[PDB]
Design a binder for this molecule. Sequence first.
Ligand SMILES: CO[C@H]1C[C@@H]2CC[C@@H](C)[C@@](O)(O2)C(=O)C(=O)N2CCCC[C@H]2C(=O)O[C@H]([C@H](C)C[C@@H]2CC[C@@H](O)[C@H](OC)C2)CC(=O)[C@H](C)/C=C(\C)[C@@H](O)[C@@H](OC)C(=O)[C@H](C)C[C@H](C)/C=C/C=C/C=C/1C
Length: 201
Amino acid sequence: GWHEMWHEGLEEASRLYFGERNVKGMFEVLEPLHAMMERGPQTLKETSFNQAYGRDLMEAQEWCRKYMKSGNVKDLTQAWDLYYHVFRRISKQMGVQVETISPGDGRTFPKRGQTCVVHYTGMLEDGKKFDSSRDRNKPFKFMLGKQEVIRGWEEGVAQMSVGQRAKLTISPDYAYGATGHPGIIPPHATLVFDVELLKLE
Ligand SMILES: CO[C@H]1C[C@@H]2CC[C@@H](C)[C@@](O)(O2)C(=O)C(=O)N2CCCC[C@H]2C(=O)O[C@H]([C@H](C)C[C@@H]2CC[C@@H](O)[C@H](OC)C2)CC(=O)[C@H](C)/C=C(\C)[C@@H](O)[C@@H](OC)C(=O)[C@H](C)C[C@H](C)/C=C/C=C/C=C/1C
């Protein structure tokens, strides 16, 4: 929906402008996204999106249009300041979110080459548990940085200190995506893991 379309679109428009110096391409990504705003929100989530980001997106569009008439890059810079703020806020509900359950030592973090020793419980977004190392009564061990584990763990556990317990809420893009894991994880599943970093080996 609107959250995912704007997140993907802002990223791609920014790759075209900043990465490829292609203003026309960036415009052609942004303009349809603004156009679909104009019918108004039609779901509760689109309404929430509009309330949160509608005004800033409308202003960003106005700076873009000022740019087409001035050719002054300062007007585009003002547009992207707004688009980036919207992007960062949308991003807080995607990827992986780390919420501390109990603090760690705040000083010892995973480093390259080390093995993380953790306890975890994985649940679907509703709360149905699908796996737990705590049920096997033994810690799970893995290494970060080599795509051994889903992206939400790669990014989430890397931020935890030894002794920390944290809740990782992982969007499907950062977990098992459209395929899921047959027999365990459905397609397009947001996952919630209760993870405790026990030690580094
Ligand atoms: C019996 O229990 C399974 C774990 C189950 C599978 C099903 C899922 C619901 C789940 O229940 O775990 C689960 O809770 C889960 O989602 N996990 C496990 C805990 C870490 C986070 C997540 C995960 O990434 O699993 C991982 C997920 C399922 C698949 C990987 C996701 C990242 C992606 O890049 C990889 O592409 C290939 C595949 C599984 C793992 O954590 C194991 C450790 C890692 C792998 C299998 C791959 O990294 C593999 O790549 C060749 C390796 O290099 C390994 C070390 C080679 C050795 C011989 C294989 C070990 C296999 C161990 C299997 C184990 C303990």
